[PDB]
Structure formats: C-alpha cells, structure tokens
C-alpha cells in the first residue's frame, strides 16, 4: 500500500503535457535530449566556436554517466546553439564508478576534476586521452587525489590560485589539494589540508570568487561555514551560521556582489546571505515543493539565480523584485521574486549550468537521463 502514491507519476505526466503545450509561449529555445545514461553532473565549458558565416555557434558540456555496470565515462558533449541544432558526444573517457560531479579548472579548462564513488577525486586532462574509450575497461586518471574515506559531491577549483581544489565528502570533511606543482602523470596526491568543522555529511563547498583564501561549505548539520585558509585551526571556521531547518545541500557566491551568497536546502528554501553579517539571513526564497540540491547565480546578471532539486522543477529568481506589488491573482502563482518555473523535467534534476556565452541559456539534466538546453522567452526577463 506504499507504491500507490508513487504511481502518481500520473500527475507528473499530466503536468508535462501542459508544459510541452505551452513551450512556444514560455521559451525562446527548448532542446531535449535523452542521453545514453543519466548524467549526475553538467557544466558548460567556457569556450565557444562560431563557424564562418553560419547561423549557429558550437558549445560544449562536461557530462558524466551514471550506470550500475562497469562502463562509466566522463563525457564531453557539443551543442549547436543559434546566434523547439544538434547534440553530439565528442569524447568519452573511462571513469571508475559513476561520475558524481565533474568540474573544469578555470585556469585551464582541459583539466577536469571528478568525484567518484570510491572516495578519490580524479583529475583528467581530456586532451591526453583518445576520443574513444579504452576497451580494456581500465581507468587511467592523470592524477588521483587521496584524502577522503567516503564519496561526496562538493567540488570547487580556486579561480584565483591555480590548482587549489576543494572537495566535500560524506565523511564529514573537506579536502584541499594543491596540484599546481605536480606533473599530471598519474601520481597519487595526498590532501594538503583537511577541514573538520562539520559534524555531518558535507554536501557542498565553494571558493569565494575574489578572495583567494576564503571558501564556504554547507553540510547536513544545517550549517553554512566560512573558512579562511590563512587560519591555523582547521577544525573551526571563521564563521558558522545556523542556515536552515534541515540539510544544506548547495551554496553559490554571487559573481558580481562579493559579500553575497545563496544556499539551498532540504527545508525547500534558498537562503540569501551577506558575509558582512551572517547572523541575519537576507531573504528566504520559498516556492520549491521538495528538497533543493543545486543553486547557481546567473553569470550575466547580478540579481538572477536559479535553483533545482527533487521536485523536478528549476526555479529562476530575481532578487530585484523582492517586495514588488502583484495583483492578487498574479500573487497566486508565486512571490514577485520568482521569475520563472522550468517544468520540462519529469524526474529529479541532478545538476544544471548557466551557459556563460549565451545569456539565459541553461542546461539541466535529470535522473531519467534527459538533458534539456533551454531559454525562457525574452519577454519574461524584460518586463
């Protein structure tokens, strides 16, 4: 008498019908693609090819596989975008276990770090591997980063210190590696520093974008922690905030507002934070119906951020609309700061990435192996 509620599902399919029927009015772009396997991870590479006098540009994504066999890959996919275009797998690299998360290094986007079900973080240089995977089934990472006892998801490259990499784990710790001086030839590298302030699964970690010594972490202990690598005490952060009424799954620093960040939580809210006074939450974004797992600021607009999670929705928020007036009927669809609800996915969303070269384009991937590349209608973000 327990699977009957899981058989709705019927509600999902009905809402999907309605959504597809309305995409002409809500979107300027909708591309849907069933991947061979679900990807737990998605990140646009920063580069973009705009071929000679053609009406499209070529973009690329770091993706992964999630299969229960022994043929998992780190994937690089290409995406033709116009200036309701195809999607091609360019490279597959043998990967040990499913790819929990894959992130390119800002100072050299050929370098990809991945999180694996074994506690290791693997580093690949995808230019050093063939386009077709090794039929031996063997995984040959360019670096093997040691230090965790359990898998995790949080992964962050320092954008101001080349090769300084943070990782968050279910073992309650945060590992910092510095691979800057290490030749990427398959060596094992031990963690330079291990931060132990959290008392529960650490869900996410993220470097500040301007201050090279500052980073933040969020964990199942409901805390946001702000760390400073200049501190000698690796068991106690600079700041600790009781951030949510449940697990905190993600955080993201505003790339235009150096004091501002956001966290997403199993309490179904996105919280807004000001580093200058972390005692006081600036705002709580409240319309997700289930646990939030990913939050990301717009790369192009300082007031714009997006959140996704297990309610299969991707919410786009506009903090400049906080406090706005709305007609009582318009006030039913949600708060004024809720700019858009993406309802294209029919399963839990695992990751999404704002395209850094085409404003308002987003790639989101879900558990049913669907990948969507989409852009809300221009009239929605111009009112």
């Amino acid at each position: 008498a327990a699977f009957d509620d899981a058989v709705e599902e019927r509600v999902i399919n009905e809402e999907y019908k309605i959504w597809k029927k309305n995409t002409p009015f809500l979107y300027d772009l909708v591309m849907t693609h069933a991947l061979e396997w679900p990807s737990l991870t998605a990140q646009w590479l920063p580069d973009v090819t705009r071929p000679e006098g053609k009406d499209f540009s070529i973009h690329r994504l770091v993706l992964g596989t999630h299969t229960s066999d022994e043929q998992n890959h780190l994937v690089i996919a290409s995406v033709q975008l116009p200036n309701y275009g195809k999607i091609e797998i360019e490279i597959k690299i043998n990967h040990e276990g499913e790819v929990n998360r894959a992130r390119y290094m800002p100072q050299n986007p050929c370098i990809i770090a991945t999180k694996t079900p074994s506690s290791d973080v693997l580093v690949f240089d995808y230019t050093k591997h063939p386009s077709k995977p090794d039929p031996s089934g063997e995984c040959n990472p360019d670096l093997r980063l040691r230090g965790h006892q359990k898998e995790g998801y949080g992964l962050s490259w320092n954008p101001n210190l080349s090769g300084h990499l943070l990782s968050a784990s279910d073992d309650h710790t945060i590992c910092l590696w510095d691979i800057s001086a290490v030749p990427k030839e398959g060596k094992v590298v031990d963690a330079k520093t291990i931060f132990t302030g959290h008392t529960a699964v650490v869900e996410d970690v993220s470097w500040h974008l301007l201050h090279e010594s500052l980073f933040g972490s969020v964990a199942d202990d409901q805390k946001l922690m702000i760390w400073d690598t200049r501190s000698n005490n690796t068991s106690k952060p600079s700041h600790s905030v009781d951030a949510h009424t449940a697990e905190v799954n993600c955080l993201s620093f505003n790339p235009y507002s150096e004091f501002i960040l956001a966290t997403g939580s199993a309490d179904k809210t996105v919280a807004l934070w000001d580093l200058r006074n972390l005692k006081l939450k600036l705002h709580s974004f409240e319309s997700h119906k289930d646990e939030i797992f990913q939050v990301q600021w717009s790369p192009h607009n300082e007031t714009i951020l997006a959140s996704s999670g297990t309610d299969r929705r991707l919410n786009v928020w506009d903090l400049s609309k906080i406090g706005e007036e709305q007609s009582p009927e318009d006030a039913e669809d949600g708060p004024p700061e809720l700019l858009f609800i993406h309802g294209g996915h029919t399963a839990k969303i695992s990751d999404f990435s704002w395209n850094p070269n085409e404003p308002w384009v987003i790639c989101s991937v879900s558990e049913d192996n669907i990948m969507q590349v989409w852009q809300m209608a221009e009239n929605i973000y111009n009112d």
């Binding site: 999630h66 229960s68 499913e98 998801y153």
Partner: peptide, 5 residues
C-alpha cells in the same frame, strides 16, 4: 545526504 537511483 544524496541517494543515487
């Protein structure tokens, strides 16, 4: 804590 599948 995330659960896969």
């Amino acid at each position: 804590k995330r659960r896969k599948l």
